[PDB]
């Protein structure tokens, strides 16, 4: 029991870490994509002449 209970603890903690991994990967990815669009926006500007 308790051996496999601990293994399935590890499994559900692994699932939770997969959820955190989804959070990190996709949100940092789309955030850096927003930053790419920001350099398209905030860093492609015309003012002077």
């Amino acid at each position: 029991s308790k051996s496999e209970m601990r293994k399935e603890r590890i499994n559900i903690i692994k699932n939770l870490s997969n959820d955190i991994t989804q959070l990190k990967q996709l949100f940092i990815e789309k955030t850096e994509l927003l930053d790419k669009s920001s350099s398209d926006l905030h860093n492609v500007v015309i003012i002077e002449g």
Binding site: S39, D40, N43, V44
Partner: peptide
Amino acid sequence: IFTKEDLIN
């Protein structure tokens, strides 16, 4: 740092 829109210009 350096950007590609530099190279676009």
